Design a protein around this nucleic acid. Structure first.
Ligand SMILES: [Mg+2]
Ligand SMILES: [Mg+2]
Length: 64
RNA sequence: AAGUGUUUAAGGGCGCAUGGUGGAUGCCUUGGCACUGGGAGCCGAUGAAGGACGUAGGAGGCUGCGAUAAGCCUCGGGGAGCU
């Protein structure tokens, strides 16, 4: 999705906004998929990327 | 008139040529056995060994993986092929 350095240089408020929005997008796209009106898959994996990145960066900033 | 006599195979046996079933024989090795020289001699409450269940675009199974589910990041090695 974005560069890990992109959201490293991006702020905590923007990153929480992004985590909100991207959880929403995971939700929405994953279950449009589950509705089975689609053809591809990698969207779930990309949102996996973004969730893991946000979670890791939040731990990092919260720990030090 | 007389006495003399092969002349057939329902089947069978023997050989010969053909085949049929059964898979030994010969040839092969990703498999095993036994060693040598090295490495490592533990794994676990930061939740182990081993399992249930799930995980794919596709129904099951094996392999990996774990609702973040044939996987995710960051760093380094390779490439025009991969899912
Ligand atoms: Mg399995
Ligand atoms: Mg490298």
């Amino acid at each position: 999705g974005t560069t890990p350095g992109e959201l490293r240089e991006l702020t905590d408020d923007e990153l929480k906004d992004k985590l909100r929005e991207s959880k929403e997008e995971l939700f929405n796209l994953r279950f449009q998929m589950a509705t089975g009106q689609l053809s591809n898959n990698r969207r779930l994996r990309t949102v996996r990327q973004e969730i893991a990145r946000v979670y890791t960066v939040l731990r990092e900033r919260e720990l030090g």
